[PDB]
Design a binder for this molecule. Structure first.
Ligand SMILES: [Zn+2]
Length: 89
């Protein structure tokens, strides 16, 4: 049960990735609010560049969602490997 040690390793790595995923989702949502603000400026006649800015915040939002999903997938991978080793401790 070097198994125990591998379980703890993989569990900590899973937690890491879970936190990275949560941070990315939070970042995505911060971008999502700026999309909204940008469009509202544009539409109120205060910022002709506001649609361009909204588009860039969409790119950023979507990139952060994609990095979140990837982190979540890595977390799942480590959790399966952790469970395996726990079962064999
Ligand atoms: Zn990993």
């Amino acid at each position: 049960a070097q198994h125990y040690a591998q379980a703890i390793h993989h569990e900590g790595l899973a937690r890491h990735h879970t936190t990275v995923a949560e941070d990315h989702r939070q970042t995505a949502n911060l971008h999502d609010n700026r999309i909204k603000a940008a469009k509202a400026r544009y539409n109120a006649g205060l910022d002709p560049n506001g649609l361009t800015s909204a588009q860039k915040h969409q790119i950023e939002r979507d990139h952060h969602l994609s990095l979140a999903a990837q982190a979540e997938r890595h977390a799942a991978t480590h959790n399966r490997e952790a469970a395996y080793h726990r079962l064999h401790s």
